[PDB]
Design a protein around this nucleic acid. Structure first.
Lengths: 99, 63, 46, 102, 70
RNA sequence: UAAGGUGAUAUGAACCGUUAUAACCGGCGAUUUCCGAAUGGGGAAACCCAGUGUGUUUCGACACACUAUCAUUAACUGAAUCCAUAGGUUAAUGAGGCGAACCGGGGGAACUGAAACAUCUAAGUACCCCGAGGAAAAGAAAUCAACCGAGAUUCCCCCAGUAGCGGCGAGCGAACGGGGAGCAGCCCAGAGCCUGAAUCAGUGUGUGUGUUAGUGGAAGCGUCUGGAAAGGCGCGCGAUACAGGGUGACAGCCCCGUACACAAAAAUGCACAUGCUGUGAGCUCGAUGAGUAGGGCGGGACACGUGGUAUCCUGUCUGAAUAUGGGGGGACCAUCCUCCAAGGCUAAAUACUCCUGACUGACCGAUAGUGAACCAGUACCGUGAGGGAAAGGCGAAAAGAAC
RNA sequence: AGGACCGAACCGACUAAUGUUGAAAAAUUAGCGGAUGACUUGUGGCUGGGGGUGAAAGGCCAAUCAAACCGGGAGAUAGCU
RNA sequence: GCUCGCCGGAAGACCAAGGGUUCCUGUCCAACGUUAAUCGGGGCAGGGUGAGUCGACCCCUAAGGCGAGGCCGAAAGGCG
RNA sequence: UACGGUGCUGAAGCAACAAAUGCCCUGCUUCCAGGAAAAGCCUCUAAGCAUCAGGUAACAUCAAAUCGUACCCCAAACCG
């Protein structure tokens, strides 16, 4: 499957939050982050051919994250964008854990 | 190998090496999982080789 | 009476609009004297 | 770019440490050329709370720039500018104006 | 645009009825159409009648064609 | 070349690397997160969706390829109309996009020095609009004169502030005459003989030598005073190097400038020597595109602002003759002169210093100078259209509260 | 039925009263109507200079416009201490 | 705890003027609260607001933009 | 017990009475200033297919096309 596609710049690290605990019960609703070209189309095809595992449904999130670092009121905002995905029912973290 | 040491090669990394070379950024580069006394920030100090193909392929396809 | 200062986007098309500050020649000298020659920035494009 | 090749002995003479002698230095882009660290008594910093607060008071960065005595040998600190001839193919190492090269 | 065999004219100059007054004179505004032209159509052929005033040594080309051609 | 470096102004930390790609300079080339100037169509600047293809895939789809308005020539196509023409489907190619200002087109003011303001000056400047290149506008004589003559044009001192016009008002403001700068002639309307012979637009080559790396590049010690003696003396030496300012000061003496010897990949300056694609050369014989002008009345810029009237213009209209002359002789016409047939082409002199490069400063040394030292056209007012600041500057070593 | 008589915030504008040394170029407290329309009421594109809609006003129109918030004419005229 | 208040056409609700991410807490005093100052969106260390169906692409327009060819046009620009 | 909660488990479970700001009512009435167009809803053919193609149905699936969603209101980060 298609290897000339936007996946190569479009992921970031996983996002580690408490919902890897509280929300993951009889399936795995885990948190991710993704970069500036992430329309849902490019986040859909990525996980199965990059990380070796297979998801149902993806949700995608305009998080407009205000920052300051200059001492005098200002700085940057980034692309920031969070995602959610669905590591299915029972395969959880069974060889390695990306937290 | 700073790219320039492998130039003899019959094909370029878009043949599937492009992903074996880039998986680390999304699977290991998080808090301390790629290291804690030995590694830190990899992608320019050493691993800058991968970006260089993206001119070269345009370079070669025309030669 | 309803004085005065406020922000909005849709009201920029006859008065405050960057492509119209280049479309009109009257704006075009300002635009260069304000950034391209004026050593500066605007960036407020939103 | 300096053509004098970093293994070498120098002193301070363009300042009150007049006479203080040492070799190789520490050299980077825009370095103040600190001889061998010929400092006296000058504090270090205490930001950390834990067991290791830097007890130091000497050898931190103390300046006298470029070179005022063209590599010492016996006495005398000229000529600096003089650029010589072939020794390495791609570069040239230098000594001073009566002794050819190192 | 009306006389186009001799290209254009709207100048702005005046009628001096009491010293150099700015009562503008030169703005033409009168139009005519239609003549039996060099093939078959009694065609849209515009004038004032100027053009046709000027028509007394042409064979339907040597002046007429100036805007016809390019 | 010569060794260190990761453009930074928290440097914490990785990680290249002193063998000849670690960065970084430089010739040329290559790079697309979407807008895009942007262009299938849409526009509330950062687009949101049409069209049709392509290598190939875990056969989900994919990263990607290309289109428009014009000016101009091929091909196919095609009306109310035998025919004509118009209008589409392509094929090709370049410009439409962007400059402060010059320059060509014209516009373009109001009041205001005139002691009144409906002449003028104001003012061809505010701007706004349109062109197309670095130089232009020009320019090859219905030019100027007295019979002496001059030669595209006019420039430069003049003559002159002369002639010369006026609410007789304030402004505007020539030319000839002399000295000079200058100091040369063709081509069609076209056939022939001649025939890569003269030029240049291009596009590769060698030198003659540029552009910049690489190559370089000067003198001294002691002593009394001494945080730095780089002052003072001594002259122990110095000079086409004694800019200016840096190094903690005042340094011929260390400098960094000069003065001088050596030298590049690879496009490529310009001059030539050439080479490949394209041009026209030589010498006869032919050749002659009037709606052009005239007036009679308007609008006119002209040295002449209404007036008797002056062109070369311009607009409703009218309307000849080929140099066996008359268009005109800065009133009108003699005597008689000069341009010349109304198509196109010319070496020199003028301006724009974008910015960056060489040298002078009874010029700016932050009450300023290009809005400009900044990183200040940036923020303190703006329904805003944007007017733009109060503002020079610790100082061996951030040597920046050890203790 | 009637621009009814008498009804809520969606209306303006009578004199005061604590509005003038402002909460304020305008709004106020126990009060008080025009009661469904000669009503006012809101996103935005047509009125872009000597304006341009008229319950017809010299009031408007940025809040004090008989032409101002423009700075380019222009550091104008100047009988002006 | 103990006794009562203000908004009573509630500063109850979700979100449209884009100004935008400065809500919860973990912790804080200038760069501020004309009092204390523990609180004030002050302000800082974390992170964040999960939309195939919400509404706007769409097919769609009354008013109104632009618009082939054009009636015209000083250069501008006007109306369709 | 991390003093938020979550861990284990669990009653009862019927009818009357009275009014909407809302549901039915693009019903149905009453009065006239006279309440705007392409569509879904529902079907007629034109061509041209025409032993071909189309559409409607049981059930099997995949695509579900860049935002925004945070604080905030008959109204202190709008404006004043």
């Amino acid at each position: 499957m298609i290897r000339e596609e936007r996946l190569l710049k479009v992921l970031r690290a996983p996002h580690v939050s408490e919902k890897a605990s509280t929300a993951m019960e009889k399936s795995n609703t885990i948190v991710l982050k993704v970069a500036k070209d992430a329309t849902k189309a490019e986040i859909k095809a990525a996980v199965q051919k990059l990380f070796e595992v297979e998801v149902e449904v993806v949700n995608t999130l305009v998080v407009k994250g205000k920052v300051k670092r200059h001492g005098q009121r200002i700085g940057r905002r980034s692309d920031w964008k969070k995602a959610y995905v669905t590591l299915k029912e029972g395969q959880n973290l069974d060889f390695v854990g990306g937290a | 190998m700073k790219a320039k040491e492998l130039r003899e090669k019959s094909v370029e990394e878009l043949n599937t090496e492009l992903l074996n070379l880039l998986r680390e950024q999304f699977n290991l580069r998080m808090q301390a999982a790629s290291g804690q006394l030995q590694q830190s920030h990899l992608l320019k100090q050493v691993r800058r080789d991968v970006a260089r193909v993206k001119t070269l392929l345009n370079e070669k396809a025309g030669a | 009476m309803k004085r005065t200062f406020q922000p909005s986007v849709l009201k920029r098309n006859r008065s405050h609009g960057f492509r119209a500050r280049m479309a009109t020649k009257n704006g075009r000298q300002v635009l260069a004297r304000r950034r391209a020659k004026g050593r500066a920035r605007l960036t407020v494009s939103k | 770019a300096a053509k004098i090749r970093r293994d070498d002995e120098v002193i301070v003479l363009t300042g009150k440490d007049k006479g203080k002698r040492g070799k190789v230095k520490n050299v980077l882009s825009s370095g103040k050329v600190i001889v061998e660290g010929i400092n006296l008594v000058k504090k270090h910093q205490k930001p950390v709370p834990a067991l290791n607060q830097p007890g130091g008071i000497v050898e931190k960065e103390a300046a006298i720039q470029v070179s005022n005595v063209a590599i010492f040998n016996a006495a005398t600190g000229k000529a600096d500018r003089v650029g010589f001839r072939f020794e390495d193919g791609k570069k040239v190492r230098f000594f001073k104006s009566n002794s050819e090269t190192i | 645009m009306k006389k186009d065999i001799h290209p254009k004219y709207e100048e702005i100059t005046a009628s001096c009825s009491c010293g150099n007054v700015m009562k503008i004179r030169s703005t033409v505004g009168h139009d005519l159409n239609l003549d039996v032209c060099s093939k078959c159509h009694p065609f849209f052929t515009g004038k004032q009648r100027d053009v046709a005033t000027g028509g007394r040594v042409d064979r339907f080309n040597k002046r007429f064609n100036i805007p016809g051609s390019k």
